[PDB]
């Protein structure tokens with residue numbers, strides 16, 4: 001039932017990808033994070049998804065959504 005240990009790592013990543021350090025990000029470097037250690041989405045997966053988030057969501061992702069989307073492992 002690991003979570004806080006795995007999440008703690010995401011916190012560092014979120015900031016690492018956060019260049020504006022404004023406490024927010026988008027489907028820009030987000031996809032680059034999934035391939036870093038996530039699940040490495042396919043070709044259209046990293047696109048269809050990134051966009052889906054860009055459109056559906058609104059065009060922004062918070063450390064919460066990033067963590068939630070990242071999930072534990074699967």
Ligand SMILES: [Ca+2]
Pocket residue numbers: 018019020021022023024025
């Ligand atoms: Ca930010």
